[PDB]
Design a protein around this ligand. Structure first.
Ligand SMILES: CC(C)(COP(=O)(O)OP(=O)(O)OC[C@H]1O[C@@H](n2cnc3c(N)ncnc32)[C@H](O)[C@@H]1OP(=O)(O)O)[C@@H](O)C(=O)NCCC(=O)NCCS
Ligand SMILES: CC(C)(COP(=O)(O)OP(=O)(O)OC[C@H]1O[C@@H](n2cnc3c(N)ncnc32)[C@H](O)[C@@H]1OP(=O)(O)O)[C@@H](O)C(=O)NCCC(=O)NCCS
Ligand SMILES: CN[C@@H]1[C@@H](O)[C@@H](O[C@@H]2[C@@H](O)[C@H](O[C@H]3O[C@H]([C@@H](C)NC)CC[C@H]3N)[C@@H](N)C[C@H]2N)OC[C@]1(C)O
Lengths: 189, 185
C-alpha cells in the first residue's frame, strides 16, 4: 500500500524542489521533451510526493487555472480548475501503483478546492486516467491568447481529460463542445 | 500573532462557512464571486477559541506583462484576497500577521505577488516592499480582447519575488490580469 504526501510549493525546500524537478525530467526523457515551461507549469499549487531512502520516486502537482466553457445557451463560464502537471514515476519503480498513489492524492486536492480537474495526458498515462473515471474531452480545444482571440490548439485536441467535481448549480458539461484554457507560456495545455 | 496556512482543500466545511461569514461580516459589500475568488489557494487563519478572527488568502493567477521588445510574459502570480479581521480585534496587528504568512507563500511559490488596495493602505504596502503600479491595467476577456479595467479607488500592488529570465518590471507600462467573473482585480 502506497500513500503520497501532499505539500505546497511554498513548503518545498530547495533540495526537494531541485530533486523533484530533476526526477520528473528524467522520467519523461528517453535517451516530446519536459522543458522548464513544463516545470514552471507544475509550480504554485500542491505536490504529491513519494520518496525512498530520501530520493523522490513519484511526483505530481495540481495548480489552479481557469477553463472557459460556453453552453448551448451561449452563456460563458470561467471555471476554477485544478490542473494536473508533472506526474511521473521513476522508471525502475513503475508498474506497482505509485502512479495511482500520486493521482489519489491530487484528486483529493481537486475535489476539495476546485470546480473541475483537467489535464492533457501523455499516451502512456491515458489508461490510468480512464480507469479512474476521467472524461475524455471530445470537442475542439483552444487557448485564450492576449492578442489574437481564442485560438484553436489542434495539437491538444485528443489529449484532454476532465473530472467534474463541483460544477456550478445547473451547469451540464458537454464534452462534445469547445473548451478553452487561460493563457500561459509554453504549451497552453 | 502568528497565522497558520492551510490550503482550501484541507478546510472542513465549518471553517469554510465560518471564514466566508467572518469575511462577509468584516466587509460591512463582499459578493459571492468575491468569495469564489478566495478559493483554491492557501488560507491564512488566526483563530482564538474556535472563533476565526483574521483571515486572508493567496490564489494562483497569471498576470500578463509586455516588455520593450513586444515579447509577452505570463507571470505566475499569487493574488492576495479577502484579507479581513474581526471588527472588535482590529488595530492589534492581525491583518499584518495575515499579510506576513501570505507573503511567505508568495516568496516560496510564485514569480510575483499582487493585491488591490485602497490608497489608505498604500504606505504600509510600500513599507512592506510592494511596488505601486503606475501604468494602465486591463483584463484579458474571452469574447472581447484585452479590455481596459476602469480606475476605482483601489490601487494595484505587485511584489517582485522571482521574475523569470532576468526580466525587470517597468511599473509604468501595461499589466493585464487573467479573466474571472465578478471583479477581475
Ligand atoms: C504514467 C506513469 C506515471 C505511470 O506510473 P506507474 O507507477 O507505472 O503506474 P501504476 O503502476 O500506478 O499504474 C496505475 C494504473 O494505470 C493504469 N495503466 C497504466 N498503464 C496501463 C496499461 N498499459 N494498460 C492498462 N492500464 C494501465 C492501470 O489501470 C494501472 O492500474 P493497473 O496496473 O492495476 O491496471 C509512468 O509510466 C511515467 O512516469 N511515465 C512517464 C510519462 C509521464 O510522466 N506521463 C505523465 C502522465 S500525464
Ligand atoms: C484592513 C484590516 C484587515 C486590517 O486589520 P488590522 O487587524 O486592523 O490590521 P493591523 O492591526 O495589522 O493594522 C491595521 C491597519 O490600520 C492601522 N491602524 C489601526 N489602528 C491604528 C491606530 N490606532 N493608529 C495607527 N494606525 C492604526 C494599522 O497600522 C494598519 O494600517 P497602517 O499601519 O497603514 O496605519 C481590517 O481593517 C479589516 O478587516 N478591514 C475590513 C476588510 C478590508 O477592508 N480588507 C481589505 C484589506 S486590503
Ligand atoms: C494528440 N497528441 C497528443 C500529444 O500532443 C501529447 O499531448 C501533450 C501532452 O502530453 C502534454 O502534457 C504532458 O507532457 C508535458 C511535457 C513533458 N511535454 C511532453 C508535461 C505534462 C504532461 N501532462 C501537454 N502539455 C501538451 C500535449 N500536446 O501526448 C498525447 C497525445 C494524445 O499523443
Amino acid at each position: 500500500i502506497h500513500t503520497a504526501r501532499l505539500i505546497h510549493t511554498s513548503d518545498l525546500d530547495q533540495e526537494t524542489r531541485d530533486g523533484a524537478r530533476r526526477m520528473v525530467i528524467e522520467a519523461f526523457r528517453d535517451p516530446d521533451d519536459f522543458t522548464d515551461d513544463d516545470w514552471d507549469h507544475a509550480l504554485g499549487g500542491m505536490h504529491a510526493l513519494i520518496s525512498h531512502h530520501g530520493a523522490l520516486i513519484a511526483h505530481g502537482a495540481v495548480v489552479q487555472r481557469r477553463l472557459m466553457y460556453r453552453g448551448p445557451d451561449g452563456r460563458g463560464h470561467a471555471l476554477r480548475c485544478g490542473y494536473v502537471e508533472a506526474v511521473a514515476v521513476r522508471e525502475d519503480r513503475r508498474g506497482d501503483g505509485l502512479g495511482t498513489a500520486v493521482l489519489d492524492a491530487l484528486e483529493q486536492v481537486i475535489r476539495g478546492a476546485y470546480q473541475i480537474g483537467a489535464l492533457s495526458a501523455s499516451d502512456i498515462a491515458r489508461p490510468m486516467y480512464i480507469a479512474r473515471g476521467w472524461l475524455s474531452w471530445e470537442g475542439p480545444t483552444s487557448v485564450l491568447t492576449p492578442t489574437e482571440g481564442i485560438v484553436r490548439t489542434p495539437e491538444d485536441d485528443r489529449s484532454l481529460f476532465v473530472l467534474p467535481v463541483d460544477l456550478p448549480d445547473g451547469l451540464e458539461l458537454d464534452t462534445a463542445r469547445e473548451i478553452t484554457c487561460d493563457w500561459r507560456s509554453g504549451d497552453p495545455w
